[PDB]
């Protein structure tokens, strides 16, 4: 059972990692084994990405403090967040390969620049290379 | 699909691997020599775990895993058999340098992110077998 | 089985069992089993209950027995007419008035004491209630 103190703690932690990160990915993860998840948690920590499953009511609270305040309409159904704190991109590509290889889920919506990205136009943050590519 | 633990340079006897994997539909002479040809680099006297993946055409493909946590703690402390009553009877001792040696080997199978995370996972296997951290 | 080691006299007048109990508080342990009824507890019932509650707590904690079967009970055998003297003592009873704390316990969590007392209560001829220690 989650108390209010606990919920206020979870909103704080996901509000702190909201500001800091550059690209955030919101996706469905229903009907996928923990074996495949711990495998996306290894490939996430490696790419400098913060992975979490947060209550959609609790997300609409952490995201209200700007700039993801357009990811609201993506807080319907099971939600998993991929907050990239080290180098923009990483996740938006890590998820696309995980989605096609496992066939389950669809990937909800992506966020960057404080702007909404639809489920069809996620090719924008999927073709972006390194930082570290301009040289 | 079955999970087993066979020796580094030994795979053929009837009581441990014989009718255990042979009952499903796996070739007893094909796997026994293909396993020992790849585990030749693995040191003598160390049980190595192997997982079998079988299809409808009796064919097989195996992926070799790192030695178990309750296995490596026996050779590091200098014991053949563990304690019958753990944390009630002490059978050996292992240093902080020995804990990081088992963890660096187990890194390919461990779920942990950092060195400290994998080390604490081996600390738990030692306490539940009677071995004390010294 | 409880019983006085010696007594001034062997046999006692039937008497009556009116009034409310003395010793209505948990005075030694944390939990108690209080009598809500009126009646006689026999030395065997006292033992039956003590045994049931002890098994229940797996011989952990501490148990007190606040009652003592000091009343001798006589009985005339079969095929014996009335008179020709008072019968022979057969067993010992403790007179119980509503309010008596019968057994006390501590050193065990409430949930377990409650279960242990549920098991002991089933061996007794009188209705009982679970009681906890109070600040005055």
């Amino acid at each position: 059972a989650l108390n209010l103190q606990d919920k206020q703690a979870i909103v704080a932690e996901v509000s702190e990692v909201a500001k800091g990160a550059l690209s955030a990915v919101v996706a469905d993860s229903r009907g996928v084994t923990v074996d495949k998840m711990t495998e996306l948690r290894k490939a996430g920590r490696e790419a400098g990405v913060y992975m979490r499953v947060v209550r959609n009511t609790l997300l609409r609270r952490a995201v209200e403090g700007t700039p993801f305040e357009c990811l609201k309409d993506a807080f319907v159904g099971p939600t998993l967040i991929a907050y990239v704190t080290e180098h923009p991109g990483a996740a938006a590509r890590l998820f696309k390969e995980f989605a096609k290889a496992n066939a389950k889920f669809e990937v909800k919506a992506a966020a960057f620049e404080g702007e909404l990205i639809p489920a069809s136009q996620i090719d924008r943050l999927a073709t972006l290379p390194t930082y570290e590519e301009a040289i | 699909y079955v999970k087993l633990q066979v020796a580094a340079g030994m795979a053929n006897p009837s009581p441990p691997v014989g009718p255990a994997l042979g009952q499903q539909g796996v070739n007893i002479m094909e796997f026994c020599k293909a396993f020992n040809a790849k585990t030749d680099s693995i040191e003598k006297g160390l049980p190595i775990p192997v997982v079998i993946t079988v299809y409808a055409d009796r064919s097989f493909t195996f992926v070799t895993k790192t030695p178990p946590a309750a296995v490596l703690l026996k050779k590091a402390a200098g014991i053949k058999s563990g304690s019958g009553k753990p944390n009630k009877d002490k059978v050996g001792k292992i240093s902080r340098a020995q804990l990081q040696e088992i963890a660096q080997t187990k890194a390919a199978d461990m779920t942990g992110a950092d060195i400290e995370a994998m080390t604490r996972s081996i600390e738990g296997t030692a306490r539940s077998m009677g071995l004390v951290v010294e | 089985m409880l019983q006085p080691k010696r007594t001034k006299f062997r046999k006692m007048h039937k008497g009556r069992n009116r009034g409310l109990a003395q010793g209505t508080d948990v005075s030694f342990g944390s939990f108690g089993l209080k009598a809500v009824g009126r009646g006689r507890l026999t030395a065997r019932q006292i033992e039956a209950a003590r045994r049931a509650m002890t098994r229940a707590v797996k011989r952990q904690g501490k148990i007190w027995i606040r009652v003592f079967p000091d009343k001798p009970i006589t009985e005339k055998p079969l095929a014996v007419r009335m008179g020709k003297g008072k019968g022979n003592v057969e067993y010992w009873v403790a007179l119980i008035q509503p309010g008596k704390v019968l057994y006390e316990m501590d050193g065990v969590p409430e949930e377990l004491a409650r279960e242990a007392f549920k098991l002991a209560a089933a061996k007794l001829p009188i209705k009982t209630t679970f009681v906890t220690k109070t600040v005055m």
Binding site: - | - | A21, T24, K34, P98, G99, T129, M136
Partner: protein, 94 residues
């Protein structure tokens, strides 16, 4: 801060006290100091829920007797022989 509402007793004795308890109320006394003791009546449900809190027996309580406020401390309690009820409370002027 525990606040108890009380009425002064218009009657005393066995008869009158038993009538109170039958009416979901209970007698109590306030004594101590230069002042005369004050025989009062309390709502059973209200004081019964209060006395469940450990603090009731340690803290200084306020008894509201017809406007006036009396600072007291729980001196003694007479509990029912087997029911979770209260028969009488001795309040000492604090």
């Amino acid at each position: 801060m525990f606040t108890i509402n009380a009425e002064v007793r218009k009657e005393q004795g066995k008869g009158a006290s038993r009538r109170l308890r039958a009416a979901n109320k209970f007698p109590a006394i306030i004594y101590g100091g230069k002042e005369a003791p004050l025989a009062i009546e309390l709502d059973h449900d209200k004081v019964m829920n209060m006395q469940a809190k450990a603090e009731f027996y340690s803290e200084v309580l306020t008894i509201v007797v017809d406007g006036k406020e009396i600072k007291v401390k729980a001196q003694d309690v007479q509990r029912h022989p087997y029911k979770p009820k209260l028969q009488h409370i001795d309040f000492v002027r604090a």
